[PDB]
From a paper:
The DOCK-A (DOCK1/2/5) and DOCK-B (DOCK3/4) subfamilies specifically activate Rac and have an Src homology domain at their N-terminus; the Src homology domain is involved in autoinhibition and binding to engulfment and cell motility (ELMO) scaffold proteins.
However, the ELMO1NTD was poorly resolved due to its high mobility. To address this, we symmetrically expanded and refined the particles focusing on ELMO1 NTD. Through 3D classification, excluding the DOCK5 DHR-2/Rac1 segment, ELMO1NTD was resolved into several conformations. One class, comprising approximately 12% of the particles, provided a map of sufficient quality to define the structure of DOCK5/ELMO1 bound to RhoG at 4.9 Å resolution. Cross-linking mass spectrometry confirmed RhoG’s placement within the cryo-EM map. RhoGQ61L formed a primary interface (∼440 Å2 buried surface area) with the ELMO1RBD and a secondary interface (∼260 Å2 buried surface area) with DOCK5C2 (A−C). Consistent with the previous crystal structures of the RhoG-ELMORBD complexes, the primary interface involved ELMO1 residues such as Lys9 and Leu21 interacting with the switch 1 and 2 regions of RhoGQ61L in the GTP-bound conformation. By contrast, the secondary interface consisted of aromatic or aliphatic amino acid residues, such as Val232, Phe345, and Trp400 of DOCK5, which interacted with Arg127 and Lys130 of the Rho insertion region (α3′ helix) of RhoGQ61L.
Author numbering:
A (entry chain A): 1 to 727
B (entry chain B): 1 to 294
The structure:
């Protein structure tokens, strides 16, 4: 709520001016402070000149940021952001080069200044850049022919200043002309050029692609991927970052139909493998942006798998039915006499049901009922098609070993293939939306375009190998796939980097010995916390949370003298909000400044049904906070400002008296809503109390320790025939 | 689930970990899920739970961490040391009474006492755990009996609970209705103790010296422990430091001068004491304390 230290002991500077450390007043309109500063250097024209942080920003201090001058923060006078903007612009549309170079580097650097950007965008000096780098070449190109190192530095600084003003958005993204993109094409479509130009130009490429799918379309003629590989090959990492940023923008904005096209394009130009060998498994550091680049590449491949993943292609479609027919021929014809390869409908039913009670299918009239569910549907089919090319040994051996097991140890290859593909895609997040959120790249995927397909074959291979090692069953069908998922977890947690290393990690998993090591670590980590006993504790959770909630219900009933909107000028900053015993009606409103707190009655707003309650937005999220006029609220009430939602048009836009009870009431209204709590008070009390409770359970064992693992179940007499009776 | 035998060597029906609903009367058993079992089948024990003494639990014998004794620990001597563990089990009952209290303590907000509840609880349970064995010397076990009795009755008077009697060796030997007047005066004594605690908690909650005087009333040998550190001055000559108690009230000396040697170098002439410049001035009797100026 308070303003800053209005009298700040700061240096004031100016080009040519010896700084004077004066105690500047800050509530005064800054125009007059500029006036007195100018007068200090015997200067007039205060609106023609701006003070700024003599520190790094050089941001021309306006009325807005004068709270940011600390004791010792040097202030430097200079031309006003309008005057810097103008000096720039008439230097910018001009032609004398070195002057343009200086002004252009400086427009680059100063573009981020909002205070400057206001008047340089009012000015339209960015179109003056458009002049200096699309006409300014042809005014001069006779000597530019040799100066083109320095003219390239010119146009690159123009690219910088241009985009560094574009990002603020007050200037339109349309200031670049088709001549600007023509120069950018001359960059990207040409060989290695001055690294500033290539850098900032590829940056413009991705930026204008980001501005419009239409800009992306009309640069895709110039932005091509084969010419874009050299940007990766450029040992400068950032050229690789820019080629892959452009690539990811391409796939984001290419249509999914054209996305499969550009995916085959990616596969053939080696992007997966060439980035693996030139970024991941080259020596170049995989910076966070670069690791994200690789994550997005793999997940772009994955969301091109998505179109087949999610969509439920017809299980009874004739083409896919004959392709699973050929899959099942190369799978079954070993024990399936070849008369079923062209078997009749009666014989088709007979063979379905015979080797599908050997495949344990609930429905034995169709293998495609094991493809009738997506994810992935015909994508697991795609996996087996990869197997016909890459893992025919694996496909044949799995299918044959489950081609004779009528029992429930049966490995249902249609159902298992479909569900394993879907669960491992969900593990691998195959098809998720690529975002900057995830920055993990698996070099496993980038040594093989279909490392997902080899993933599924080798994981089903491990499934069958350990399937022998853990008497895996089809009443454990989901359970065996989940044990296989546990193995997939212990493998991917080692972060596989190649097909051989992934195979090594899976061969580690075949329940041979290392499981004792993981459970020995589980031992060492329960030492301090007793994980099975943690199971005991947190299993019987609900009692403690619900008692805390009804406790808070008590507290809501006794409520408080809540605080209102702008409780400034004789308004009830104190007014009671009683929760009714009914716990469906809140009694509140403009209730008087009550010392004892609640006057239990039909308050001014006596009602509040949960039936219209949506949520509570907490802080600036409050609609009253979204007001920026006569209801401005300083961010120190962020923790007191709550807006309880109801009616979709009237909300409880009020202030708490402190923080803890704000958290309390939010918790209580959430319990009313029947959701989680948001008082750390709840965290602390619940953990300490339930931990004590279980610490009040250790009693029957004490002086003797627990069997950590489950002991067995000793046998009974099956009957209930009591040698000593009950009762 | 059959072939059950009548026996009393199973009332320590002791759950191990999360049990399962595989059985008619079973669930994710806690640690201390005691079942006072009646039905003895070899591999399985079904018997009346502590929680519900008319409801059985059918729990695997291996899952039963059975201790042959009943809740007592001396009839077959499950007392790691004779003569107390009846006290620890009644302590456990005391604790499960504190259980229902601390449930009924967030319903109101007296939570100051709720804090001190947990802390006295922690002290009691650590005494419990340390006396899981005969870890202390026996006299110290009597001391701990005294202290646990003290804390327990404190909690009880806090909740306005009953009076426990038989300060030591059980809290239970006296209340066995063997006499009357002895029992009456036992109640009388316990009420005395409650009075003492209320008075002291007021007078240690608010005052901080009368407690020290009352404790110094019994014993009267005291010692001012001084660890001297270094005499800040440079001397340039050998020096001798003497440390004794003088009585201006008596215009005379009291104690023998503890000695320190000092080198000429601003340094103790003996360096093995430089860290250990330790004297303890003893013989401080009640009179020594109460003298006006010392």
């Amino acid at each position: 709520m308070p303003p800053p230290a209005d009298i700040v002991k700061v240096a004031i500077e100016w080009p040519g001016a010896y700084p004077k450390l004066m105690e500047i007043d800050q509530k005064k309109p800054l125009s007059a402070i500029i006036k007195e500063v100018c007068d200090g250097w015997s200067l007039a024209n205060h609106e023609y000149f701006a003070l700024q942080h003599a520190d790094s920003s050089n941001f021309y201090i306006t009325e807005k940021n004068r709270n940011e001058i600390k004791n010792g923060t040097i202030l430097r006078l200079t031309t006003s952001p309008a005057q810097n903007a103008q000096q720039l612009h008439e230097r910018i549309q001009s032609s004398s080069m070195d002057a343009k170079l200086e002004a252009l580097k400086d427009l680059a650097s100063l573009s981020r200044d909002v205070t400057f950007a206001q008047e340089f965008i009012n000015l339209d000096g960015i179109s003056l850049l458009t002049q200096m780098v699309e006409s300014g070449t042809e005014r001069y190109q006779k000597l530019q022919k040799i100066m083109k190192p320095c003219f390239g530095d010119m146009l690159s600084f123009t690219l910088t200043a241009f985009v560094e003003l574009m990002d603020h958005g007050i200037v339109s993204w349309d200031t670049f002309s088709v001549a600007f993109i023509k120069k950018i094409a001359s960059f990207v479509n040409k060989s290695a050029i001055d690294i500033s130009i290539l850098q900032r130009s590829l940056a413009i490429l991705e930026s204008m692609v980001l501005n419009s799918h239409d800009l992306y379309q009309k640069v895709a003629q110039e932005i091509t991927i084969g010419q874009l590989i050299p940007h990766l090959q450029g040992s400068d990492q950032e050229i690789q970052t820019y080629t892959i940023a452009v690539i990811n923008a391409l796939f984001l904005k290419a249509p999914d139909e054209r996305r499969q096209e550009m995916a085959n394009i990616l596969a053939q130009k080696q992007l997966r493998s060439i980035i693996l060998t030139h970024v991941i498994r080259a020596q170049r550091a995989i910076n966070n942006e670069m690791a994200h680049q690789l994550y997005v590449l793999q997940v772009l491949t994955f969301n091109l798998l998505e179109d087949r993943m999610m969509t439920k292609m017809d299980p009874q479609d004739q083409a896919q039915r004959d392709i699973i027919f050929e899959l099942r021929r190369i799978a079954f014809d070993a024990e399936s006499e070849p008369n079923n390869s062209s078997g009749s409908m009666e014989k088709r039913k007979s063979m379905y049901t015979r080797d599908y009670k050997k495949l344990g299918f609930i429905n034995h009239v169709n293998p495609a009922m094991d493809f009738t569910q997506t994810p992935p549907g015909m994508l697991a089919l795609d996996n087996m098609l990869y197997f016909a090319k890459h893992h025919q040994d694996a496909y044949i051996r799995i299918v044959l070993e489950n081609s004779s097991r009528e029992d429930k140890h049966e490995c249902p290859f249609g159902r298992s293939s479909i569900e394993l593909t879907k669960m491992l895609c969900e593990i691998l997040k195959v098809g998720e939306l690529p975002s900057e959120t995830c920055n993990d790249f698996h070099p496993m995927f980038f040594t093989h375009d279909r490392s997902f397909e080899e993933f599924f074959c080798i994981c089903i291979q491990l499934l069958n190998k350990t399937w022998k090692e853990m008497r895996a069953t089809s009443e454990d069908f989901n359970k065996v796939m989940q044990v296989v998922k546990e193995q997939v977890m212990r493998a991917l947690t080692t972060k596989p980097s190649s097909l051989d290393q992934f195979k090594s990690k899976l061969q580690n998993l075949s329940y041979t010995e290392i499981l004792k090591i993981r459970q020995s670590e589980r031992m060492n980590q329960e030492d301090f916390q007793s994980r099975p006993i943690l199971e005991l504790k947190e299993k019987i959770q609900p009692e403690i949370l619900e008692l805390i909630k009804q406790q808070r219900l008590n507290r809501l009933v006794e409520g408080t003298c809540f605080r209102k909107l702008n409780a400034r000028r004789r308004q009830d900053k104190f007014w009671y909000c009683r929760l009714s015993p009914n716990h469906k009606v809140l009694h509140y409103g403009d209730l008087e400044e009550s010392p004892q707190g609640e006057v239990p009655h039909d308050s001014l707003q006596d009602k509040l049904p949960v039936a219209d309650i949506k949520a509570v937005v907490t802080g600036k999220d409050c609609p009253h906070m979204k007001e920026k006029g006569a209801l401005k609220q300083n961010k120190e009430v962020l923790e007191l400002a709550f807006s309880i939602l109801y009616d979709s048009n009237c909300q409880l836009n009020f202030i708490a008296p402190d923080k803890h009870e704000y958290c309390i009431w939010t918790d209580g209204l959430n319990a009313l809503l029947g959701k989680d709590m948001m008082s750390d008070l709840t965290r602390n009390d619940l953990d300490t109390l339930l931990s004590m409770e279980i610490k009040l359970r250790l009693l029957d064992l004490e002086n003797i320790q627990i069997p950590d693992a489950p002991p067995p179940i000793p046998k009974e007499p099956s009957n209930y025939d009591f040698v000593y009776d009950c009762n | 689930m059959a072939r059950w035998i009548p026996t009393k060597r199973q009332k320590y029906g002791v759950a191990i970990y999360n049990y399962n609903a595989s059985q008619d009367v079973e669930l994710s058993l806690q640690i201390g899920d005691t079942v006072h079992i009646l039905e003895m089948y070899e591999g399985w024990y079904r018997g009346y739970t502590l929680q519900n003494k008319s409801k059985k639990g059918i729990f695997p014998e291996t899952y039963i961490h059975l201790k042959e004794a009943t809740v007592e620990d001396l009839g077959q001597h499950e007392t790691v040391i004779p003569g107390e563990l009846p006290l620890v089990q009644e302590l456990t009952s005391t604790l499960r009474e504190w259980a229902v209290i601390w449930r009924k303590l967030y319903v109101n907000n007296k939570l100051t006492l709720f804090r001190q509840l947990q802390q006295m609880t922690y002290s009691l349970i650590e005494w419990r755990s340390q006396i899981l064995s005969g870890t202390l010397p026996k006299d110290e076990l009597a001391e701990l009996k005294k202290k646990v009795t003290a804390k327990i009755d404190h909690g009880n008077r806090m909740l306005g609970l009953d009076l426990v009697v038989r300060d030591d060796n059980g809290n239970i030997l006296d209340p066995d209705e063997t006499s009357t007047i002895a029992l009456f005066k036992a109640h009388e004594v316990a009420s005395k103790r409650i009075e003492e605690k209320i008075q002291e908690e007021k007078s240690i909650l608010q005052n901080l010296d009368l407690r020290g005087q009352s404790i110094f009333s019994t014993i009267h040998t005291y010692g001012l422990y001084v660890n001297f550190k270094n005499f800040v001055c440079n001397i340039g000559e050998d020096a001798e430091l003497f440390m004794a108690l003088y009585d201006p009230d008596q215009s005379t000396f009291i104690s023998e001068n503890y000695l320190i040697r000092w080198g000429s170098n601003g340094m103790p002439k003996e360096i093995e004491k430089l860290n250990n410049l330790q004297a303890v001035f003893t013989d401080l009797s009640s009179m020594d304390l109460i003298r006006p100026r010392v």
